[PDB]
Design a protein around this motif. Structure first.
Motif, short mmCIF file in Angstrom:
data_model
loop_
_atom_site.label_atom_id
_atom_site.label_comp_id
_atom_site.label_asym_id
_atom_site.label_seq_id
_atom_site.Cartn_x
_atom_site.Cartn_y
_atom_site.Cartn_z
N UNK B 22 0.83 -1.21 0.00
CA UNK B 22 0.00 0.00 0.00
C UNK B 22 0.86 1.26 0.00
N UNK B 23 2.01 1.20 0.68
CA UNK B 23 2.90 2.35 0.76
C UNK B 23 3.49 2.70 -0.60
N UNK B 24 3.64 1.69 -1.46
CA UNK B 24 4.23 1.81 -2.79
C UNK B 24 3.19 2.45 -3.71
N UNK B 25 3.35 3.75 -3.97
CA UNK B 25 2.32 4.55 -4.64
C UNK B 25 1.99 4.04 -6.04
N UNK B 26 2.99 3.63 -6.83
CA UNK B 26 2.69 3.21 -8.20
C UNK B 26 1.84 1.94 -8.22
N UNK B 27 2.00 1.07 -7.22
CA UNK B 27 1.25 -0.18 -7.19
C UNK B 27 -0.23 0.07 -6.90
N UNK B 28 -0.52 1.09 -6.08
CA UNK B 28 -1.89 1.35 -5.63
C UNK B 28 -2.81 1.65 -6.81
N UNK B 29 -2.32 2.37 -7.81
CA UNK B 29 -3.15 2.76 -8.94
C UNK B 29 -3.43 1.60 -9.88
N UNK B 30 -2.80 0.44 -9.67
CA UNK B 30 -2.87 -0.69 -10.59
C UNK B 30 -3.89 -1.69 -10.05
N UNK B 31 -4.74 -2.19 -10.94
CA UNK B 31 -5.77 -3.15 -10.55
C UNK B 31 -5.17 -4.50 -10.16
N UNK B 32 -5.51 -4.96 -8.96
CA UNK B 32 -5.01 -6.24 -8.46
C UNK B 32 -5.58 -7.41 -9.26
N UNK B 33 -6.90 -7.41 -9.46
CA UNK B 33 -7.57 -8.51 -10.14
C UNK B 33 -7.21 -8.59 -11.62
N UNK B 34 -6.83 -7.46 -12.23
CA UNK B 34 -6.64 -7.40 -13.67
C UNK B 34 -5.57 -8.36 -14.18
N UNK B 35 -5.88 -9.02 -15.29
CA UNK B 35 -4.98 -9.98 -15.90
C UNK B 35 -4.09 -9.23 -16.88
N UNK B 36 -2.80 -9.54 -16.86
CA UNK B 36 -1.85 -9.00 -17.82
C UNK B 36 -1.15 -10.18 -18.47
N UNK B 37 -1.08 -10.19 -19.80
CA UNK B 37 -0.50 -11.34 -20.48
C UNK B 37 1.01 -11.34 -20.35
N UNK B 38 1.56 -12.53 -20.09
CA UNK B 38 2.97 -12.79 -19.98
C UNK B 38 3.38 -13.02 -18.54
N UNK B 39 2.72 -12.32 -17.62
CA UNK B 39 2.89 -12.37 -16.17
C UNK B 39 2.16 -13.54 -15.53
N UNK B 40 1.51 -14.39 -16.34
CA UNK B 40 0.63 -15.45 -15.85
C UNK B 40 1.32 -16.36 -14.84
#
Lengths: 96, 146
Positions: B22-40
């Protein structure tokens, strides 16, 4: 040798460059405050080039860029145009 | 060894890692549930029903975090190790034999993503870690089983 009966060199060592999906042109832009910059992209999906109408752009994965900025330069390639640029604020190590 | 204290500490370590992310500001704006290809390969929100699943998930996350040069990330990897150890002691208090999870054998691919895009690997790994920890925390009262 350009001038005269020159002999050809041997060939250079072969260099292989295998590309990856998704194209950015340009890959990077270094600019100053107040300038205008635009990016173009192509998205390859399962050995197919998708239509530009499908392509959507995002900034830092946080949020979608407004549709007004998009311009359809061609059927295959989409473009975003930025105006009145403001300084990029750094997030941790990353300046851009 | 007090069982209740260990359970509360396990809860605490999970909340701890979540808050760190939560402290890491760039991570907060990113959707947790969202799927990104390659990172599977990164163990994101996919039902983590059991302790062995939790252990292997944390192991993979530790392996990914260890490779990225960031001061916060190294500690998060350490926290994940301690969480795994907590799960092992809980499995012992429950008379379960948890084998020590190895990380992913398939790291020969992770190098490519780390080189090409460090940002994607970091933001995805952190946001999916936060999500996985949150469901783990929810389930830890449900009487988790081995």
């Amino acid at each position: 040798r350009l001038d005269g009966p020159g002999i050809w060199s041997d060939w250079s060592t072969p260099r292989v460059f295998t590309t990856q999906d998704v194209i950015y042109f340009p890959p990077k832009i270094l600019t100053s405050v107040g300038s205008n910059v635009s990016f173009h992209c192509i998205y390859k999906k399962e050995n197919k080039i998708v239509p530009s109408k499908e392509i959507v752009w995002w900034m830092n994965l946080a949020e979608k860029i407004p549709q007004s900025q998009y311009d359809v330069v061609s059927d295959h390639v989409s473009k975003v145009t930025f105006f009145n640029l403001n300084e990029t604020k750094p997030r941790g190590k990353f300046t851009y | 060894v007090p069982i209740q204290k260990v359970q509360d500490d396990t809860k605490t370590l999970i909340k701890t890692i979540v808050t760190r992310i939560n402290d890491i500001s760039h991570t907060q704006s990113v959707s947790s549930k969202q799927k990104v290809t390659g990172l599977d390969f990164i163990p994101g929100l996919h039902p983590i029903l059991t302790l062995s699943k939790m252990d292997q998930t944390l192991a993979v996350y530790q392996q990914i975090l260890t490779s990225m040069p960031s001061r916060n990330v190294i500690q998060i990897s350490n926290d994940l190790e301690n969480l795994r150890d907590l799960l092992h002691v809980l499995a012992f208090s429950k008379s379960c034999h948890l084998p020590w999870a190895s990380g992913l054998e398939t790291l020969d691919s992770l190098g490519g993503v780390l080189e090409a895009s460090g940002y994607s690997t970091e933001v995805v790994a952190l946001s999916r870690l936060q999500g996985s920890l949150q469901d783990m925390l929810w389930q830890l009262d449900l009487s988790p089983g081995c």
